[PDB]
């Protein structure tokens, strides 16, 4: 990949004094430079509500890293998450972000890494954070982040990757951008590291139907008094993560009745404190979702 | 501590079949049972805006752990943070929370642990999560969490403690409650693990003055056009974390002028892209804080 290295050397003259190692050369082919990206923000319609926040969170820290590294009150986010329903253009938006900020772009395909290296894959993940640190400003892009790193070997890679992710905290020039269609399926350990999340677009009635179906797939619903279609039709403006909060509020309403009757039995001397009794959290109803619809504004 | 163990055995009869180890017996003295706590919510005035959220986040998961462990849509928070200005009663509120929910209460004094054990302190921290798991429901209380675990030895304890903190995620019966007067000084790795944060009370004008003073202690302020007292007097309703967002917005306004003039110089061919020029992020002014005052509502 001597041809790839010669171009990045001419862009920043200080790069010719840098030496890669054996594992970093193999990943050098996976690097996309800003002049190779073909898409801009102009080619993407509907970014008007996001342009301002995208600059403050992504574009400015990459173009202007001296300010965030010199100012205590200014910090670049550890990771940025772009999410929306299927067909919102999350992958092209990340490429536009890379070109709009003049930063390099590396797209991790963990399956492509794992299938080629197996047990040696952690050295490829490690040599990729160092390579992104050398080719700064560099955007580490993780598409379909909900499935990123799913047995016991895949758990070793997670603990290693999170250590590397927290390592670039003191680094305004390296950014991790995640993209997903299933925000509710993102590992909680990832979401803790994505402080900035950008809603690309809203899900339609059919998409909100499927989101609620997956959210309630292991929850006991009422055989008579439950209506998925009515709930999905009256949740316009709800995102995937807003619908999860609606299901959380619905289950909370039933759990309140549960603990109210449980206290009534204990405070009336009916049952023991540790007594297992007839108390089972009741199946959810349509009213629990209709009566918790204002969770969207919280 | 055979006397302490006999009381906890009579409260829950299944506990007499449990065996502690050598390190867990030493911590058994540090356990406070609900009948030893003397304070309730009635003895604390001003909790009316917080009572509802305190139940959903702390009291209900501890009294009703079978529901959160049986319901996928219901999860107990990993950690809860109680914060407010000095004199808000954060420590007594955590004790009221423990008594109101009938859970055991262990107060970690890391200095008391470190001073007694030094290098063996990690085994005491480890034997304390297991002891809280056995004496469930148990509240792990961390007061003055901003100073919790601050050289290289104190970093080993952090990585160990965070591993234990993430270990009790699958545990509705063990909760970590942190308290602080300096929320802006909390380690970011802690804040990522405190999803629920309860504002006990608001800081007064004098307290908002000191908060802004510490926040801006390393930031270049204008010699003529800066007024701390005016900003502190007109930030009523701002918390400690809201004042940090105000300082973040102020520094953002100056950084916008910086990157605007930087682009003007590059787009006019005046300077090189990597040219170090006369561009220095300008000292903050009073107007940057007055013009970013609506960050409180975001």
Coordinates of C-alpha atoms in Angstrom, one line a residue:
Chain A
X1 CA 0.0 0.0 0.0
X2 CA 2.9 2.4 -0.8
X3 CA 0.6 4.3 -3.2
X4 CA -1.9 5.0 -0.4
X5 CA 0.8 6.1 2.0
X6 CA 2.3 8.6 -0.6
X7 CA -1.0 10.5 -0.9
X8 CA -1.5 10.9 2.9
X9 CA 2.1 12.1 3.1
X10 CA 1.5 14.9 0.6
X11 CA -1.6 16.1 2.3
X12 CA 0.1 16.6 5.7
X13 CA 3.9 16.9 5.2
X14 CA 4.6 15.9 8.8
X15 CA 3.3 12.4 8.0
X16 CA 6.4 11.3 6.1
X17 CA 8.3 11.2 9.4
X18 CA 5.8 8.5 10.8
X19 CA 6.4 4.8 10.6
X20 CA 3.7 2.1 10.6
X21 CA 4.1 -1.4 12.0
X22 CA 3.1 -4.7 10.4
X23 CA -0.5 -4.7 11.6
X24 CA -1.1 -1.0 10.7
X25 CA -0.1 -1.5 7.1
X26 CA -2.8 -4.1 6.5
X27 CA -5.4 -1.6 7.6
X28 CA -4.0 1.2 5.5
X29 CA -6.0 -0.1 2.6
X30 CA -9.2 0.5 4.6
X31 CA -8.6 4.2 4.8
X32 CA -10.8 6.6 2.8
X33 CA -9.5 10.2 2.4
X34 CA -11.8 13.2 2.2
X35 CA -11.1 13.7 -1.5
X36 CA -12.3 10.2 -2.1
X37 CA -15.7 10.7 -0.4
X38 CA -18.1 11.9 -3.1
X39 CA -21.1 13.1 -1.0
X40 CA -21.7 16.4 0.9
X41 CA -24.5 17.8 3.1
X42 CA -26.0 19.4 0.0
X43 CA -26.7 16.0 -1.5
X44 CA -28.7 15.0 1.6
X45 CA -32.0 16.7 2.2
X46 CA -33.6 17.1 5.6
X47 CA -30.4 17.9 7.6
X48 CA -31.6 21.4 8.4
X49 CA -32.6 20.6 12.0
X50 CA -29.2 18.8 12.5
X51 CA -26.7 21.0 10.8
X52 CA -26.1 23.2 13.8
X53 CA -25.6 20.3 16.2
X54 CA -23.5 18.3 13.8
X55 CA -21.1 21.2 13.6
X56 CA -20.7 21.7 17.3
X57 CA -20.3 18.0 18.0
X58 CA -18.5 16.6 15.0
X59 CA -17.3 19.1 12.4
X60 CA -15.9 21.8 14.7
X61 CA -13.8 19.4 16.9
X62 CA -12.2 17.8 13.8
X63 CA -11.5 21.0 11.9
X64 CA -10.5 22.9 15.0
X65 CA -8.8 20.5 17.3
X66 CA -6.4 23.1 18.8
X67 CA -9.4 24.9 20.4
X68 CA -10.8 21.8 22.2
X69 CA -7.4 20.8 23.3
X70 CA -6.6 24.3 24.6
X71 CA -10.0 25.1 26.2
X72 CA -11.1 23.4 29.4
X73 CA -14.7 24.3 28.8
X74 CA -14.8 22.7 25.4
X75 CA -14.6 19.0 24.8
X76 CA -15.2 16.8 21.8
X77 CA -17.7 14.0 22.4
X78 CA -16.3 10.5 22.9
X79 CA -18.7 9.0 20.4
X80 CA -21.5 10.2 18.1
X81 CA -24.5 8.1 17.2
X82 CA -26.6 8.6 14.1
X83 CA -29.9 6.7 14.3
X84 CA -33.2 6.5 12.5
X85 CA -35.7 4.1 10.8
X86 CA -34.5 2.0 7.9
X87 CA -34.0 4.1 4.8
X88 CA -32.9 7.3 6.5
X89 CA -29.4 7.3 5.0
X90 CA -27.3 6.9 8.1
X91 CA -24.3 5.6 6.3
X92 CA -24.1 8.4 3.7
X93 CA -24.6 10.9 6.4
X94 CA -21.4 9.7 8.2
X95 CA -19.5 9.9 4.9
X96 CA -20.8 13.5 4.4
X97 CA -19.6 14.3 8.0
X98 CA -16.2 13.0 7.2
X99 CA -15.9 15.0 4.0
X100 CA -17.4 18.2 5.4
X101 CA -14.8 18.1 8.2
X102 CA -11.8 17.1 6.0
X103 CA -11.1 14.1 8.2
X104 CA -10.1 10.6 7.2
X105 CA -12.7 7.8 7.3
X106 CA -12.2 4.2 8.3
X107 CA -15.1 1.8 8.2
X108 CA -14.7 -1.2 10.6
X109 CA -16.3 -4.4 9.4
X110 CA -15.7 -6.6 12.5
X111 CA -16.9 -9.7 10.6
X112 CA -14.3 -9.0 7.9
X113 CA -11.7 -8.5 10.6
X114 CA -12.7 -11.6 12.6
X115 CA -13.0 -13.9 9.6
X116 CA -9.5 -13.0 8.5
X117 CA -7.7 -13.0 11.8
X118 CA -9.8 -14.9 14.4
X119 CA -7.7 -14.8 17.6
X120 CA -5.3 -12.2 16.2
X121 CA -8.3 -9.8 15.6
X122 CA -7.5 -7.8 18.8
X123 CA -4.2 -6.7 17.4
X124 CA -6.0 -5.5 14.3
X125 CA -8.4 -3.5 16.5
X126 CA -5.5 -2.1 18.5
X127 CA -3.5 -1.2 15.4
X128 CA -6.6 0.6 14.0
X129 CA -6.9 3.1 16.9
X130 CA -3.2 3.9 16.6
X131 CA -3.5 4.3 12.9
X132 CA -6.5 6.6 13.3
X133 CA -4.4 8.5 15.9
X134 CA -1.6 8.9 13.4
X135 CA -3.9 9.8 10.5
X136 CA -5.7 12.4 12.6
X137 CA -8.2 13.9 12.0
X138 CA -9.8 10.5 11.6
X139 CA -13.4 9.3 12.0
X140 CA -13.7 5.7 13.2
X141 CA -17.1 4.6 11.7
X142 CA -19.0 1.7 13.2
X143 CA -22.1 0.9 11.1
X144 CA -24.9 -1.4 12.4
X145 CA -23.4 -0.9 15.8
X146 CA -26.3 -2.8 17.4
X147 CA -24.7 -6.1 16.1
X148 CA -21.1 -4.9 16.7
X149 CA -19.4 -7.7 18.7
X150 CA -22.5 -9.8 19.0
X151 CA -19.0 -16.5 22.5
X152 CA -16.4 -16.0 25.2
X153 CA -13.9 -14.8 22.7
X154 CA -16.2 -12.0 21.5
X155 CA -16.4 -10.8 25.1
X156 CA -12.6 -10.4 25.2
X157 CA -12.8 -8.1 22.2
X158 CA -15.5 -5.9 23.8
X159 CA -13.4 -5.3 27.0
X160 CA -10.4 -4.5 24.7
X161 CA -12.4 -2.2 22.4
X162 CA -13.9 -0.3 25.3
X163 CA -10.4 0.2 26.8
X164 CA -9.3 1.7 23.4
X165 CA -12.5 3.8 23.1
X166 CA -11.8 5.3 26.5
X167 CA -8.2 5.8 25.5
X168 CA -9.0 8.4 22.9
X169 CA -10.9 10.6 25.3
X170 CA -7.8 12.8 25.5
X171 CA -7.9 13.1 21.7
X172 CA -10.0 15.8 19.9
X173 CA -8.7 14.6 16.6
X174 CA -10.1 11.0 16.7
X175 CA -13.8 10.4 16.7
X176 CA -16.0 7.3 16.7
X177 CA -19.3 7.6 14.9
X178 CA -21.9 4.8 15.2
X179 CA -24.9 4.2 13.0
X180 CA -27.9 2.0 13.6
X181 CA -31.5 1.3 12.6
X182 CA -32.2 -0.5 16.0
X183 CA -31.2 1.9 18.7
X184 CA -33.1 -0.1 21.3
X185 CA -30.9 -3.1 20.5
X186 CA -27.6 -1.2 21.1
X187 CA -25.5 -2.7 23.9
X188 CA -25.9 -0.6 27.0
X189 CA -22.1 -0.4 27.3
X190 CA -22.0 1.3 23.9
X191 CA -24.8 3.7 24.7
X192 CA -22.9 4.9 27.8
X193 CA -20.2 6.0 25.4
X194 CA -22.4 7.7 22.8
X195 CA -23.3 11.0 24.6
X196 CA -24.4 12.7 21.4
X197 CA -27.2 11.1 19.4
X198 CA -28.7 12.5 16.2
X199 CA -32.2 11.6 15.1
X200 CA -31.9 11.5 11.3
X201 CA -35.6 11.0 10.6
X202 CA -38.8 9.6 12.2
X203 CA -40.3 6.1 11.8
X204 CA -43.5 5.8 10.0
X205 CA -46.6 4.0 11.3
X206 CA -45.5 0.7 9.8
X207 CA -42.0 1.0 11.3
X208 CA -43.4 2.0 14.7
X209 CA -45.6 -1.1 14.5
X210 CA -42.5 -3.4 14.2
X211 CA -40.6 -1.5 16.8
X212 CA -43.4 -2.0 19.4
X213 CA -43.6 -5.7 18.3
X214 CA -40.0 -6.4 19.1
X215 CA -40.1 -4.3 22.3
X216 CA -43.2 -6.3 23.5
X217 CA -42.1 -9.7 22.2
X218 CA -41.4 -11.1 25.7
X219 CA -44.0 -9.1 27.6
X220 CA -47.4 -10.6 28.5
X221 CA -50.1 -8.7 26.6
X222 CA -53.9 -8.9 27.2
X223 CA -55.8 -11.3 25.1
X224 CA -58.8 -9.0 24.9
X225 CA -57.7 -5.5 25.8
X226 CA -54.7 -5.0 23.7
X227 CA -54.4 -3.2 20.3
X228 CA -51.0 -2.9 18.6
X229 CA -52.3 -1.1 15.5
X230 CA -54.1 1.6 17.5
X231 CA -50.9 2.3 19.5
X232 CA -48.7 2.4 16.4
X233 CA -51.1 4.7 14.6
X234 CA -51.2 7.2 17.5
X235 CA -47.5 7.4 18.2
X236 CA -46.5 9.7 15.3
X237 CA -43.4 11.7 16.2
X238 CA -42.1 8.9 18.4
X239 CA -38.7 7.6 17.6
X240 CA -37.5 4.0 18.3
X241 CA -36.1 5.1 21.7
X242 CA -39.3 7.1 22.5
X243 CA -41.4 4.0 21.9
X244 CA -39.2 2.1 24.3
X245 CA -40.0 4.7 26.9
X246 CA -43.7 4.3 26.2
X247 CA -43.4 0.6 26.9
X248 CA -41.4 1.4 30.0
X249 CA -44.2 3.7 31.2
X250 CA -46.9 1.1 30.4
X251 CA -45.1 -1.6 32.4
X252 CA -44.6 0.9 35.2
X253 CA -48.4 1.5 35.4
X254 CA -49.1 -2.2 35.9
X255 CA -46.2 -2.5 38.4
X256 CA -47.7 0.3 40.4
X257 CA -51.0 -1.6 40.8
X258 CA -48.9 -4.7 41.7
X259 CA -47.0 -3.0 44.5
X260 CA -50.2 -1.2 45.7
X261 CA -52.0 -4.5 46.1
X262 CA -48.8 -6.1 47.6
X263 CA -48.6 -3.4 50.2
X264 CA -52.4 -3.8 50.9
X265 CA -51.9 -7.5 51.6
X266 CA -48.8 -6.9 53.8
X267 CA -50.3 -3.9 55.7
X268 CA -53.5 -5.8 56.3
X269 CA -51.6 -8.8 57.8
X270 CA -52.9 -11.0 55.0
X271 CA -49.4 -12.3 53.8
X272 CA -45.9 -12.5 55.0
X273 CA -43.3 -10.1 53.8
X274 CA -41.3 -12.8 52.0
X275 CA -44.5 -14.7 51.2
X276 CA -44.9 -15.7 47.6
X277 CA -48.5 -15.1 46.9
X278 CA -51.0 -14.7 44.1
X279 CA -49.2 -11.5 43.0
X280 CA -48.1 -11.6 39.4
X281 CA -47.4 -8.5 37.3
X282 CA -50.5 -8.2 35.2
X283 CA -50.6 -8.3 31.4
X284 CA -50.4 -4.9 29.7
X285 CA -53.4 -3.3 28.2
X286 CA -54.1 -0.7 25.5
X287 CA -54.9 1.9 28.2
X288 CA -51.4 1.7 29.7
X289 CA -49.9 3.0 26.5
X290 CA -52.6 5.6 25.8
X291 CA -52.3 6.9 29.3
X292 CA -48.5 7.1 29.1
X293 CA -48.3 8.9 25.8
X294 CA -46.8 12.1 27.3
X295 CA -43.5 10.4 28.0
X296 CA -42.3 11.6 24.6
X297 CA -42.0 15.2 26.0
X298 CA -40.0 14.1 29.0
Chain B
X1 CA -19.5 -9.5 65.0
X2 CA -21.7 -12.5 65.9
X3 CA -24.3 -10.1 67.4
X4 CA -24.7 -8.3 64.1
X5 CA -25.0 -11.5 62.2
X6 CA -27.8 -12.8 64.5
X7 CA -30.1 -9.9 63.9
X8 CA -29.8 -10.1 60.1
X9 CA -30.5 -13.8 60.4
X10 CA -33.8 -13.2 62.2
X11 CA -35.0 -10.6 59.7
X12 CA -34.6 -13.0 56.7
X13 CA -34.6 -16.7 57.8
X14 CA -32.8 -17.8 54.7
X15 CA -29.6 -15.9 55.8
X16 CA -28.6 -18.4 58.5
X17 CA -27.6 -20.8 55.6
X18 CA -25.1 -18.2 54.2
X19 CA -21.4 -18.2 55.1
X20 CA -19.1 -15.2 55.1
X21 CA -15.4 -15.2 54.4
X22 CA -12.6 -13.5 56.3
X23 CA -12.8 -10.2 54.4
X24 CA -16.6 -10.0 54.6
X25 CA -16.7 -10.4 58.4
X26 CA -14.6 -7.2 58.9
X27 CA -17.1 -5.2 56.8
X28 CA -20.1 -6.7 58.7
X29 CA -19.6 -4.0 61.3
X30 CA -20.1 -1.3 58.7
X31 CA -23.7 -2.5 57.9
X32 CA -26.7 -0.4 59.1
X33 CA -30.1 -2.1 59.1
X34 CA -33.3 -0.3 58.3
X35 CA -34.5 -0.4 61.9
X36 CA -31.2 1.4 62.9
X37 CA -31.9 4.3 60.6
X38 CA -33.8 7.0 62.4
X39 CA -34.9 9.3 59.6
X40 CA -37.8 9.1 57.1
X41 CA -39.1 11.3 54.3
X42 CA -41.5 13.0 56.7
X43 CA -38.5 14.4 58.6
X44 CA -37.1 16.0 55.3
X45 CA -39.0 18.9 53.9
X46 CA -39.0 19.8 50.2
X47 CA -39.0 16.2 48.7
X48 CA -42.4 16.7 47.2
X49 CA -41.0 17.2 43.6
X50 CA -38.8 14.1 44.1
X51 CA -41.0 11.6 45.9
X52 CA -42.5 10.2 42.7
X53 CA -39.1 9.8 40.9
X54 CA -37.4 8.4 44.0
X55 CA -40.0 5.6 44.2
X56 CA -39.7 4.6 40.5
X57 CA -35.9 4.7 40.6
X58 CA -34.9 3.6 44.1
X59 CA -37.7 2.5 46.4
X60 CA -39.7 0.3 44.0
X61 CA -36.7 -1.7 42.7
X62 CA -35.6 -2.5 46.3
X63 CA -39.0 -3.4 47.8
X64 CA -40.2 -5.1 44.6
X65 CA -37.1 -6.8 43.1
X66 CA -39.2 -9.8 41.7
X67 CA -40.9 -7.4 39.2
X68 CA -37.8 -5.9 37.8
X69 CA -36.1 -9.3 37.5
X70 CA -39.2 -10.8 35.8
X71 CA -40.1 -7.8 33.5
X72 CA -37.9 -7.1 30.5
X73 CA -39.4 -3.6 30.1
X74 CA -38.5 -2.7 33.8
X75 CA -34.9 -2.2 34.9
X76 CA -33.4 -0.8 38.1
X77 CA -30.8 1.9 37.5
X78 CA -27.2 1.0 37.9
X79 CA -26.5 4.0 40.2
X80 CA -28.4 6.9 41.6
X81 CA -26.9 10.3 42.2
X82 CA -28.2 12.8 44.8
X83 CA -26.7 16.3 44.3
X84 CA -27.3 19.8 45.4
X85 CA -25.6 22.9 47.0
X86 CA -23.9 22.5 50.4
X87 CA -26.4 22.2 53.1
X88 CA -29.1 20.4 51.1
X89 CA -29.1 17.3 53.2
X90 CA -27.8 14.8 50.7
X91 CA -26.5 12.3 53.3
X92 CA -29.7 12.2 55.3
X93 CA -31.8 11.8 52.2
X94 CA -29.8 8.6 51.3
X95 CA -30.5 7.2 54.8
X96 CA -34.2 8.0 54.4
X97 CA -34.1 6.2 51.1
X98 CA -32.6 3.2 52.7
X99 CA -35.2 3.1 55.5
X100 CA -38.2 3.9 53.3
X101 CA -37.3 0.9 51.2
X102 CA -36.4 -1.5 54.0
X103 CA -32.9 -2.1 52.5
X104 CA -29.6 -2.4 54.3
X105 CA -27.2 0.5 54.2
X106 CA -23.4 0.4 53.9
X107 CA -21.4 3.6 53.8
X108 CA -18.0 3.3 52.1
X109 CA -15.3 5.5 53.5
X110 CA -12.5 4.7 51.0
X111 CA -10.0 6.6 53.1
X112 CA -10.9 4.5 56.1
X113 CA -10.5 1.4 53.9
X114 CA -7.2 2.5 52.3
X115 CA -5.6 3.7 55.5
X116 CA -6.3 0.3 57.1
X117 CA -5.5 -2.1 54.2
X118 CA -3.3 -0.1 51.7
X119 CA -2.6 -2.7 49.0
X120 CA -5.1 -5.2 50.3
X121 CA -7.9 -2.6 49.9
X122 CA -9.2 -4.1 46.6
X123 CA -10.1 -7.3 48.5
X124 CA -12.1 -5.2 50.9
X125 CA -13.9 -3.5 48.0
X126 CA -14.5 -6.9 46.4
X127 CA -15.8 -8.5 49.7
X128 CA -18.2 -5.5 50.0
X129 CA -20.0 -6.1 46.7
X130 CA -20.5 -9.7 47.6
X131 CA -21.6 -8.9 51.1
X132 CA -24.1 -6.4 49.7
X133 CA -25.3 -9.1 47.3
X134 CA -25.8 -11.5 50.2
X135 CA -27.5 -8.9 52.4
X136 CA -29.9 -7.9 49.6
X137 CA -31.7 -5.6 49.4
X138 CA -28.6 -3.4 50.1
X139 CA -27.8 0.2 49.3
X140 CA -24.1 0.8 48.6
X141 CA -23.7 4.5 49.6
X142 CA -20.8 6.6 48.3
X143 CA -20.8 10.1 49.9
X144 CA -18.6 12.9 48.5
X145 CA -18.3 10.8 45.3
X146 CA -16.4 13.6 43.5
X147 CA -13.3 12.8 45.6
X148 CA -13.9 9.0 45.6
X149 CA -10.6 7.4 44.5
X150 CA -8.9 10.8 43.9
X151 CA -1.3 7.7 42.3
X152 CA -0.9 4.6 40.1
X153 CA -2.3 2.4 42.9
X154 CA -5.5 4.5 43.1
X155 CA -6.1 3.8 39.4
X156 CA -6.0 0.1 39.9
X157 CA -8.8 0.4 42.4
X158 CA -10.9 2.5 40.0
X159 CA -10.7 -0.2 37.2
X160 CA -11.5 -2.8 39.8
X161 CA -14.5 -0.9 41.3
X162 CA -16.0 -0.2 37.9
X163 CA -15.8 -3.9 37.1
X164 CA -17.7 -4.6 40.3
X165 CA -20.2 -1.8 39.6
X166 CA -21.0 -3.2 36.1
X167 CA -21.2 -6.6 37.7
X168 CA -24.3 -5.8 39.7
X169 CA -26.2 -4.7 36.6
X170 CA -28.0 -8.0 36.7
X171 CA -29.1 -7.4 40.2
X172 CA -32.2 -5.5 41.1
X173 CA -31.5 -5.9 44.8
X174 CA -28.2 -4.1 45.0
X175 CA -28.0 -0.4 44.4
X176 CA -25.2 2.2 44.5
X177 CA -26.3 5.7 45.6
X178 CA -23.8 8.6 45.2
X179 CA -24.0 12.0 46.8
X180 CA -22.1 15.2 46.1
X181 CA -21.9 18.9 46.5
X182 CA -19.6 19.3 43.4
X183 CA -21.4 17.5 40.5
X184 CA -19.1 19.2 38.0
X185 CA -16.1 17.6 39.7
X186 CA -17.4 14.1 39.4
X187 CA -15.2 11.8 37.4
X188 CA -16.7 11.3 33.9
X189 CA -16.4 7.5 34.3
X190 CA -18.7 7.8 37.4
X191 CA -21.2 10.0 35.7
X192 CA -21.6 7.5 32.9
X193 CA -22.8 5.0 35.6
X194 CA -25.2 7.4 37.3
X195 CA -28.1 7.5 34.8
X196 CA -30.6 8.8 37.4
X197 CA -29.7 12.1 39.1
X198 CA -31.9 13.9 41.6
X199 CA -31.6 17.7 42.2
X200 CA -32.2 18.0 46.0
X201 CA -32.3 21.8 46.0
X202 CA -31.0 24.8 44.0
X203 CA -27.8 26.9 44.8
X204 CA -28.2 30.4 46.0
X205 CA -26.6 33.5 44.4
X206 CA -23.5 33.2 46.6
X207 CA -23.1 29.5 45.8
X208 CA -23.6 30.1 42.0
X209 CA -20.9 32.7 42.3
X210 CA -18.4 30.1 43.7
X211 CA -19.5 27.5 41.1
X212 CA -18.8 29.8 38.2
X213 CA -15.5 30.8 39.8
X214 CA -14.2 27.2 39.9
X215 CA -15.6 26.5 36.4
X216 CA -13.8 29.6 34.9
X217 CA -10.6 29.3 37.0
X218 CA -8.5 28.2 34.0
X219 CA -10.4 30.1 31.4
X220 CA -9.2 33.5 30.1
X221 CA -11.6 36.2 31.0
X222 CA -11.8 39.7 29.7
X223 CA -10.0 42.3 31.8
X224 CA -12.6 45.0 31.1
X225 CA -15.8 43.3 29.8
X226 CA -16.4 40.6 32.4
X227 CA -18.7 40.6 35.4
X228 CA -18.9 37.5 37.6
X229 CA -21.4 39.0 40.1
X230 CA -23.9 40.0 37.4
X231 CA -23.8 36.5 35.9
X232 CA -24.2 34.9 39.3
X233 CA -27.1 37.2 40.2
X234 CA -29.0 36.4 37.0
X235 CA -28.7 32.6 37.0
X236 CA -31.4 31.8 39.6
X237 CA -32.8 28.4 39.0
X238 CA -29.4 27.2 37.5
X239 CA -27.9 24.1 39.2
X240 CA -24.2 23.4 39.4
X241 CA -24.5 21.3 36.1
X242 CA -26.6 24.0 34.5
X243 CA -23.9 26.6 35.2
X244 CA -21.4 24.3 33.6
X245 CA -23.5 24.3 30.4
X246 CA -23.6 28.1 30.5
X247 CA -19.8 28.2 30.5
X248 CA -19.8 25.6 27.7
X249 CA -22.2 27.8 25.7
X250 CA -20.1 30.9 26.4
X251 CA -16.8 29.3 25.2
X252 CA -18.8 28.0 22.2
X253 CA -19.7 31.5 21.1
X254 CA -16.1 32.6 21.2
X255 CA -14.9 29.4 19.4
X256 CA -17.5 30.2 16.7
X257 CA -15.9 33.6 16.0
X258 CA -12.5 31.8 16.0
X259 CA -13.4 29.2 13.4
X260 CA -15.3 31.9 11.4
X261 CA -12.1 34.1 11.1
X262 CA -10.0 31.0 10.6
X263 CA -12.1 29.9 7.6
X264 CA -12.0 33.5 6.3
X265 CA -8.2 33.5 6.3
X266 CA -8.0 30.1 4.7
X267 CA -10.7 30.7 2.1
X268 CA -9.1 34.0 1.2
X269 CA -5.7 32.4 0.6
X270 CA -4.2 34.4 3.5
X271 CA -2.8 31.5 5.5
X272 CA -1.9 27.8 5.0
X273 CA -4.3 25.1 6.3
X274 CA -1.7 23.9 8.9
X275 CA -0.4 27.5 9.3
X276 CA -0.1 28.6 13.0
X277 CA -1.3 32.2 12.8
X278 CA -2.5 35.0 15.0
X279 CA -5.6 32.9 15.8
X280 CA -6.1 32.4 19.6
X281 CA -9.5 31.7 21.2
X282 CA -10.5 35.0 22.6
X283 CA -11.2 35.8 26.2
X284 CA -14.8 35.3 27.3
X285 CA -17.0 38.3 27.9
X286 CA -20.1 39.0 30.0
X287 CA -22.2 39.0 26.8
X288 CA -21.3 35.4 26.0
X289 CA -23.0 34.3 29.3
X290 CA -26.0 36.6 29.0
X291 CA -26.6 35.5 25.4
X292 CA -26.4 31.8 26.2
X293 CA -28.7 31.9 29.2
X294 CA -31.4 29.8 27.5
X295 CA -29.2 26.7 27.7
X296 CA -30.9 25.9 31.0
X297 CA -34.1 24.9 29.2
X298 CA -32.2 22.5 26.8

